[PDB]
Amino acid sequence: FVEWXWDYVXXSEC
Amino acid sequence: GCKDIFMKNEILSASQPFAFNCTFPPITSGEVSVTWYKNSSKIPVSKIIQSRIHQDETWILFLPMEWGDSGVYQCVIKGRDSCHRIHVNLTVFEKHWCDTSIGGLPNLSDEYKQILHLGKDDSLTCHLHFPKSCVLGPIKWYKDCNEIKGERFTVLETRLLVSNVSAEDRGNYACQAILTHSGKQYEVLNGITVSIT
Amino acid sequence: QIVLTQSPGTLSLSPGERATMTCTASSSVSSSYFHWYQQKPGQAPRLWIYRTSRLASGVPDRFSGSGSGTDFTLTISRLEPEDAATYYCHQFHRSPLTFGAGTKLEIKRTVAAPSVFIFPPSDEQLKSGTASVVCLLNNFYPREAKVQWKVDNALQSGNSQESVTEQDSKDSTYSLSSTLTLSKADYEKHKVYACEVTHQGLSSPVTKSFNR
Amino acid sequence: QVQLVQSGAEVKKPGASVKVSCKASGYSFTSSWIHWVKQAPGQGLEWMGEINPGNVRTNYNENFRNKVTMTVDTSISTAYMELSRLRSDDTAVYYCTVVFYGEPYFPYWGQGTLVTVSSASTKGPSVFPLAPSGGTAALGCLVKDYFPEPVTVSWNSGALTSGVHTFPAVLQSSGLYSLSSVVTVPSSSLGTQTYICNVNHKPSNTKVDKRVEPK
Ligand SMILES: *[C@@H]1O[C@H](CO)[C@@H](O[C@@H]2O[C@H](CO)[C@@H](O[C@@H]3O[C@H](CO[C@H]4O[C@H](CO)[C@@H](O)[C@H](O[C@@H]5O[C@H](CO)[C@@H](O)[C@H](O)[C@H]5NC(C)=O)[C@@H]4O)[C@@H](O)[C@H](O[C@H]4O[C@H](CO)[C@@H](O)[C@H](O)[C@@H]4O)[C@@H]3O)[C@H](O)[C@H]2NC(C)=O)[C@H](O)[C@H]1NC(C)=O
Ligand SMILES: *[C@@H]1O[C@H](CO)[C@@H](O[C@@H]2O[C@H](CO)[C@@H](O)[C@H](O)[C@H]2NC(C)=O)[C@H](O)[C@H]1NC(C)=O
Ligand SMILES: *[C@@H]1O[C@H](CO)[C@@H](O)[C@H](O)[C@H]1NC(C)=O
Ligand code: NA
Numbered sequence: 225f226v227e228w229x230w231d232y233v234x235x236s237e238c
Numbered sequence: 239g240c241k242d243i244f245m246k247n248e249i250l251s252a253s254q255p256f257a258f259n260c261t262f263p264p265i266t267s268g269e270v271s272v273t274w275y276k277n278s279s280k281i282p283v284s285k286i287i288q289s290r291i292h293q294d295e296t297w298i299l300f301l302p303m304e305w306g307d308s309g310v311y312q313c314v315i316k317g318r319d320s321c322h323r324i325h326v327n328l329t330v331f332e333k334h335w336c337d338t339s340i341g342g343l344p345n346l347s348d349e350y351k352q353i354l355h356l357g358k359d360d361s362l363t364c365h366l367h368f369p370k371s372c373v374l375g376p377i378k379w380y381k382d383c384n385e386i387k388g389e390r391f392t393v394l395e396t397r398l399l400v401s402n403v404s405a406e407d408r409g410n411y412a413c414q415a416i417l418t419h420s421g422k423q424y425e426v427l428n429g430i431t432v433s434i435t
Numbered sequence: 436q437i438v439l440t441q442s443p444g445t446l447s448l449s450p451g452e453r454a455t456m457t458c459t460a461s462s463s464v465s466s467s468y469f470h471w472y473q474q475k476p477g478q479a480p481r482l483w484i485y486r487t488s489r490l491a492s493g494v495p496d497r498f499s500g501s502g503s504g505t506d507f508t509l510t511i512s513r514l515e516p517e518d519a520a521t522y523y524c525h526q527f528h529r530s531p532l533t534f535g536a537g538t539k540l541e542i543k544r545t546v547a548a549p550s551v552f553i554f555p556p557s558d559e560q561l562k563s564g565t566a567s568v569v570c571l572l573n574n575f576y577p578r579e580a581k582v583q584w585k586v587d588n589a590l591q592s593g594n595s596q597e598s599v600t601e602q603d604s605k606d607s608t609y610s611l612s613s614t615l616t617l618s619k620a621d622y623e624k625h626k627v628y629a630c631e632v633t634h635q636g637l638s639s640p641v642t643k644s645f646n647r
Numbered sequence: 648q649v650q651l652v653q654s655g656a657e658v659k660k661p662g663a664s665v666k667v668s669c670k671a672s673g674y675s676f677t678s679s680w681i682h683w684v685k686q687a688p689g690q691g692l693e694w695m696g697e698i699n700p701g702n703v704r705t706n707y708n709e710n711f712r713n714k715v716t717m718t719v720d721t722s723i724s725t726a727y728m729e730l731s732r733l734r735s736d737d738t739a740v741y742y743c744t745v746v747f748y749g750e751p752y753f754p755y756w757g758q759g760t761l762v763t764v765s766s767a768s769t770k771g772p773s774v775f776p777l778a779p780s781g782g783t784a785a786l787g788c789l790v791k792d793y794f795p796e797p798v799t800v801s802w803n804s805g806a807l808t809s810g811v812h813t814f815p816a817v818l819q820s821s822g823l824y825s826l827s828s829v830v831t832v833p834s835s836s837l838g839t840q841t842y843i844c845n846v847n848h849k850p851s852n853t854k855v856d857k858r859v860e861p862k
Contacts, residue, residue: 409677
């Protein structure tokens with residue numbers, strides 16, 4: 225899973 | 239064959255030019271291929287520069303994004319023996335805050351929300367992301383639907399410099415720019431809600 | 436114009452029952468733009484459910500909203516007397532903004548007889564040349580009541596008006612005022628002024644009377 | 648807290664204009680759209696239009712174009728709705744409401760303003776006691792012969808609310824309104840407590856504090 229932002233991405237196991 | 243990744247946050251845009259880049263570090267860093275699809279794992283988006291919706295480098299470009307374009311899009315990222323497919327929800331809204339409050343920004347997603355630290359020298363950004371083929375002309379800034387005209391505010395291209403942030407600086411800000419793609423001119427207006435910490 | 440067809444128009448239910456009201460849109464409304472408001476008499480509409488299913492500030496968990504595209508629903512799983520109100524659906528998608536015609540929710544309860552009080556005209560009023568005799572029926576249910584006026588055991592007609600309150604938020608009862616209007620000359624002619632009340636909670640009609 | 652305060656009720660003759668106020672607080676006034684909503688007596692809600700105080704831009708419902716005109720005075724945080732060529736169809740409670748960016752719904756509303764359109768002349772009410780005479784006693788105030796609506800009736804300057812029933816006004820044969828307000832109190836409190844009904848008819852600046860005593 226990802227939470228997308230202009231300067232960064234938040235990744236988690238799915 | 240390809241690992242499915244779901245993006246938890248929805249990206250919203252007004253019915254005007256819009257571009258979303260397939261930048262997903264660390265997976266898009268290095269020698270990788272990027273392919274955009276529109277609600278399919280077989281048929282990709284067009285690569286014809288004159289198409290209303292097309293893939294420009296690693297970006298999906300809408301010239302303009304319009305009613306009916308909302309849905310799930312896919313960015314397929316292929317490296318050296320590695321495949322990921324990102325499911326990205328892109329959503330269009332029809333109207334701008336200064337024209338009407340009806341059918342506008344449906345929710346305050348992170349991109350439309352910014353903060354200014356009280357007493358500090360801070361800044362706001364447009365959230366006007368486009369590929370290199372979309373040249374942005376002069377950028378004008380507004381506060382509560384009126385052009386900014388104050389000693390503490392300075393337009394610096396796609397950024398608004400704010401000196402000695404006060405509590406009165408809360409409100410809706412917007413940036414407007416002329417976008418020039420392939421000899422054609424389009425208008426882009428992006429809003430933000432700013433709160434003082 | 437997006438038309439919102441709300442149903443039912445009126446809903447009568449006992450506390451603890453499930454209340455269901457639907458709203459149908461002529462064109463599709465995005466989930467973020469569909470809302471419900473609660474309105475009580477003499478008060479402004481209150482945001483109740485926003486973005487199809489989110490509960491607004493102070494809204495109890497017994498309320499829930501659902502729906503998509505053109506069919507939306509507001510559900511009250513276990514009715515409380517406080518739920519007696521009118522509920523309106525609303526769309527914020529296209530101009531002009533529209534609301535459903537409303538769903539008035541009435542709360543059923545046990546029969547309660549009225550407490551009847553009679554009031555003679557004040558001496559201050561009699562100086563103006565007119566007399567008002569007021570009969571009050573307090574905290575009763577159902578709202579259906581028969582108020583009769585008698586002056587010296589002679590039944591009256593055409594000279595009285597009634598007003599009934601909205602359903603009480605706490606006890607679900609109604610109150611009613613009946614006002615007999617007479618000229619001072621006609622009031623001074625007679626002595627016995629009586630008010631006879633008929634109601635399901637009363638075995639026999641209740642007469643409240645006074646002597647001028 | 649976000650609050651919307653509207654001007655008081657008005658009676659206007661047919662053909663006249665009326666201007667209703669909506670003074671806002673609790674937020675930056677210039678950042679949000681102010682909307683106006685009509686509610687004719689016994690009917691539902693009708694959207695009239697919206698005004699952005701920042702750029703003074705207005706959008707009216709096509710049904711109210713040239714009937715409604717919206718205005719702002721950002722220096723006092725007030726929004727104005729003006730109605731012209733008044734007729735009995737314009738008689739309604741009008742509400743102002745506010746919308747915030749990215750929150751497309753009405754979370755805050757004004758108390759409402761009743762605009763009555765009538766050729767009948769204004770008239771202040773005459774307040775009369777409904778004097779009490781086992782267990783529980785009842786007393787009240789008869790607010791008679793007033794025009795237009797409304798009247799506000801409080802008891803003991805608002806300290807007494809338990810047991811109070813203020814009836815909906817009735818239009819009498821004469822064409823003037825009559826309203827009764829009652830309260831039930833314990834019989835034992837008749838001697839120990841004082842009862843005053845505070846009648847307020849703001850259209851005629853009439854304020855009456857009437858002592859209600861058992862005869
Ligand atoms: C819009 O989105 C697109 C993506 O869809 C963005 O484009 C990407 O932009 C980034 C940054 O500019 C770019 O990344 C660069 O890739 C270079 C090429 O890498 C490959 O070749 C190298 C040899 O020439 C090799 O070293 C690389 O290997 C990496 O490292 C080790 C080897 O030491 C490997 O074992 C490992 O597997 C591998 N890991 C990686 C790369 O993560 C690789 O095979 C690379 O050289 C660049 O690095 C230099 O520059 C960096 C600064 O940018 C420094 O931090 C480094 O230290 C290096 O000096 C860099 O990583 C990527 O390729 C683009 N992708 C596509 C697709 O175009 C675009 O920027 C976005 N635009 C926006 C947001 O505006
Ligand atoms: C992205 O869009 C999809 C499609 O609308 C969303 O998935 C739907 O979510 C609803 C609500 O729970 C489900 O009832 C549907 O069955 C889902 N459909 C599919 C095809 O999955 C998804 O939730 C959206 N994601 C984000 C982050 O907004
Ligand atoms: C910042 O603004 C405050 C008043 O808002 C003022 O007191 C202070 O001196 C300002 N700072 C500078 C560096 O001017
Ligand atoms: Na008219």
